[PDB]
Design a protein around this ligand. Structure first.
Ligand SMILES: O=C(O)CNC(=O)C(=O)O
Ligand SMILES: [Mg+2]
Ligand code: NI
Ligand SMILES: [Zn+2]
Length: 331
């Protein structure tokens, strides 16, 4: 069995190996990459996402989210308070202000310590979940706006034609902006490209141990657990690496820098934070190996998780018994 300790693997494809996306994902899995839940891919040195980022400041963040924390430093929830629209140029200036900028630090480890110690005492503003792409249309390799769609994968594997579309999303981050512990909708893959700016630190639980994290989360967030049998789908709970270690939960960590891709694998729980002003782009995708995970994925039916149009068909075809109750949640 490849990668039995479920370590995060880092890949360096050549320009020739960068042509066929599906084939390279299948290669990484042949080496055990999926067992970690997360892999890093460093693009060939010849590749570029686009020529420059000099002209992005007029993108609108229509609903910036202020991430307000509750709890203790290592075990907290966050809620998202909607703020007035601002441009990317306005947001970058805000990120760089004395109130919100990254503090002085020695290295990534010192910054990680400061994040866990101090996150809860601040409310950073995240420009998340913005439909759009920063890949140049002429970039032919690993262009997240040109991937094969999940609807087409389901059709190729299972023969059923379904409605829905699959497009990327932009994330504009600042110091302390946070992504809570989650897997993807329908336990899909995700791919994330850090276009510019400061790094993003990731934490991940191997898929084979995902239920250990769920059981800890039910203990740590007991009212949330009673409210919903899949409350990590709400994407609100944080648990520190210190707490995870104290409770014996297997995980790994890695820092993504500008110019690098990360891939999350089906049912790989992940969480993390931004080091400073940055812009990432991400999209979900599927492979043949996903289908069985999609069939088994938990669902939030309490009504909180409220998700895309395209998830309807996935539930309806892969999870027909759940369909009824899940749609009551969505309506
Ligand atoms: O970058 C973020 O805020 C969150 N991204 C993801 O969870 C992902 O790419 O799967
Ligand atoms: Mg612009
Ligand atoms: Ni994710
Ligand atoms: Zn729920």
């Amino acid at each position: 069995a490849q990668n039995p300790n479920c370590n995060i693997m880092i890949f360096h494809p050549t320009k020739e190996e960068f042509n066929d996306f599906d084939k390279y994902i299948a290669y990484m899995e042949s080496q055990g990459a999926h067992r970690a839940g997360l892999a890093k891919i460093i693009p060939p040195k010849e590749w570029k996402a686009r020529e420059t980022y000099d002209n992005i400041s007029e993108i609108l963040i229509a609903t910036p989210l202020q991430q307000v924390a509750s709890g203790r430093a290592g075990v907290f929830t966050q809620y998202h308070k909607k703020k007035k629209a601002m441009t990317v140029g306005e947001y970058r200036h805000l990120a760089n202000s004395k109130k919100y900028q990254t503090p002085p630090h020695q290295n990534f480890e010192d910054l990680e310590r400061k994040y866990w110690k101090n996150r809860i005492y601040n409310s950073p503003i995240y420009g998340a979940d913005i439909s759009g792409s920063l890949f140049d249309e002429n970039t032919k390799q690993w262009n997240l706006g040109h991937l094969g769609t999940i609807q087409d994968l389901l059709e190729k594997e299972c023969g059923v034609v379904i409605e829905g579309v699959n497009t990327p999303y932009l994330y504009f981050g600042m110091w302390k902006t946070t992504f809570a512990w989650h897997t993807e909708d329908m336990d899909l893959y995700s791919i994330n490209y850090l276009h510019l700016g400061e790094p993003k630190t990731w934490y991940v639980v191997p898929p084979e141990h995902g239920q250990r994290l769920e059981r800890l989360a039910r203990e740590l967030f007991p009212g949330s657990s009673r409210g919903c049998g899949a409350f990590l789908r709400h994407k609100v709970a944080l648990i520190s690496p210190t707490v995870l270690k104290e409770n014996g939960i297997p995980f790994n960590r890695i820092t993504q820098e500008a110019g690098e891709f990360m891939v999350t694998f089906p049912y790989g729980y992940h969480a993390g934070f931004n080091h400073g002003f940055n812009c990432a782009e991400a999209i979900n995708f599927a492979t043949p190996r996903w289908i069985d995970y999609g069939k088994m994925a938990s669902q939030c039916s309490c009504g909180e998780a409220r998700v895309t149009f395209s998830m309807d068909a996935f539930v309806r075809i892969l999870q027909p018994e759940r369909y009824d109750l899940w749609k009551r949640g969505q309506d």
